[PDB]
Amino acid sequence: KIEEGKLVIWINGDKGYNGLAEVGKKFEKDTGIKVTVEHPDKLEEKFPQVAATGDGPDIIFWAHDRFGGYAQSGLLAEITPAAAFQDKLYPFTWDAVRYNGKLIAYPIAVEALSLIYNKDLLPNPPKTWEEIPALDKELKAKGKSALMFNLQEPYFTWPLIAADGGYAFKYAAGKYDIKDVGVDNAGAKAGLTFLVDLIKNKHMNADTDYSIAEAAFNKGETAMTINGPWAWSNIDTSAVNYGVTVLPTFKGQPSKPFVGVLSAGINAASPNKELAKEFLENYLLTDEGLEAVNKDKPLGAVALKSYEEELAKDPRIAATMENAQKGEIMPNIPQMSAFWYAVRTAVINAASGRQTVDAALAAAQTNAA
Numbered sequence: 405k406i407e408e409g410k411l412v413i414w415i416n417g418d419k420g421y422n423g424l425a426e427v428g429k430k431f432e433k434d435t436g437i438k439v440t441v442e443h444p445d446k447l448e449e450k451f452p453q454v455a456a457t458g459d460g461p462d463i464i465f466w467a468h469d470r471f472g473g474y475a476q477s478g479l480l481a482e483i484t485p486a487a488a489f490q491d492k493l494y495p496f497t498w499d500a501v502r503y504n505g506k507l508i509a510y511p512i513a514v515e516a517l518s519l520i521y522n523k524d525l526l527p528n529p530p531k532t533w534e535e536i537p538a539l540d541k542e543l544k545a546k547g548k549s550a551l552m553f554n555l556q557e558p559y560f561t562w563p564l565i566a567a568d569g570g571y572a573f574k575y576a577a578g579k580y581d582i583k584d585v586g587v588d589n590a591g592a593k594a595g596l597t598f599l600v601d602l603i604k605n606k607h608m609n610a611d612t613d614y615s616i617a618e619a620a621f622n623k624g625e626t627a628m629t630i631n632g633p634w635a636w637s638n639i640d641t642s643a644v645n646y647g648v649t650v651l652p653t654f655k656g657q658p659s660k661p662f663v664g665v666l667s668a669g670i671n672a673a674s675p676n677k678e679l680a681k682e683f684l685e686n687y688l689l690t691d692e693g694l695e696a697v698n699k700d701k702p703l704g705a706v707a708l709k710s711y712e713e714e715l716a717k718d719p720r721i722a723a724t725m726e727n728a729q730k731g732e733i734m735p736n737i738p739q740m741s742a743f744w745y746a747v748r749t750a751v752i753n754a755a756s757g758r759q760t761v762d763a764a765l766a767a768a769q770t771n772a773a
């Protein structure tokens with residue numbers, strides 16, 4: 405079903421799909437080959453469906469945690485670029501895209517969450533989570549909440565959990581110990597506990613998705629949020645005054661957000677295996693190609709060494725790096741498919757209050773399998 409001769413590209417609707425579209429015309433200009441850009445839903449789950457029955461895109465863009473899962477199922481393209489090309493990118497980004505001594509994806513960007521605040525409505529930041537229960541009331545004397553952020557997803561709620569020692573899989577002898585999961589440890593339980601007890605005093609709401617958080621800030625209904633560099637485009641153009649800084653201290657310990665790497669590979673069935681390699685190596689990963697993508701919807705700390713240290717200036721990005729290096733990198737193994745949903749469940753359950761904090765989690769230890 406994958407057609408012989410052309411390119412179709414898959415990337416999420418929060419990154420730059422209008423920036424990556426403009427890059428397509430320079431590729432259509434020289435070689436004459438067609439390059440369509442797309443942004444479907446549940447593409448983390450749609451890809452290993454369409455690929456597992458001989459379909460799907462030429463190229464897919466996502467955090468590196470799924471690609472080891474796609475390398476297991478056997479629906480990827482093993483990339484073999486020259487080592488001189490691997491010398492142009494920060495070496496550690498390849499240690500993400502290497503499941504079992506062999507290559508499967510190019511790295512493009514380095515992601516991490518960072519505290520954004522409404523400099524206008526709230527001048528200085530809180531440095532513990534602990535003071536937000538007092539911070540809420542003062543702004544709630546003007547119809548405005550302290551913090552709001554997507555609670556439904558685990559990516560945003562994990563930073564707070566990890567702080568006090570909350571871990572997916574224990575780091576035992578190079579590889580990851582699957583058999584010791586740590587979502588239901590004493591530190592993690594108390595982390596989640598604080599997210600729930602924030603909500604129980606109406607200082608956040610339980611069912612606040614992504615769209616509500618963004619909009620609420622981007623106009624001004626609330627004075628804080630937790631989001632990536634990708635949301636700086638809409639904030640800038642919605643004309644808000646905002647700094648970026650550290651993700652603050654749960655129990656005098658730093659939030660450890662899971663550090664993703666926006667990476668890309670090619671389909672197993674695909675007949676255009678060297679067509680994407682000429683597109684990837686030459687056009688996109690450049691100080692012209694990564695510019696127009698960063699223009700539309702920022703990536704922050706890019707993987708190509710040359711363009712990264714040209715835009716390392718912005719205190720926003722530096723602060724994004726500060727969180728990132730203080731947090732830890734996402735593991736790549738297959739069960740990271742299952743790990744994310746185990747918590748995704750357990751969070752919402754206790755978040756609203758449907759279940760006890762301890763039961764939802766001590767269940768979710770089982771779910772990671």
Ligand SMILES: OC[C@H]1O[C@H](O[C@H]2[C@H](O)[C@@H](O)[C@@H](O)O[C@@H]2CO)[C@H](O)[C@@H](O)[C@@H]1O
Pocket residue numbers: 416418466467469515557558559560562662664666744
């Ligand atoms: O922790 C899992 C949770 O976060 C990540 O999703 C991120 C993704 O990493 C970013 O590149 C961007 O797309 O924002 C996403 C959240 O909306 C995980 O990759 C994914 O399992 C899940 O969303």
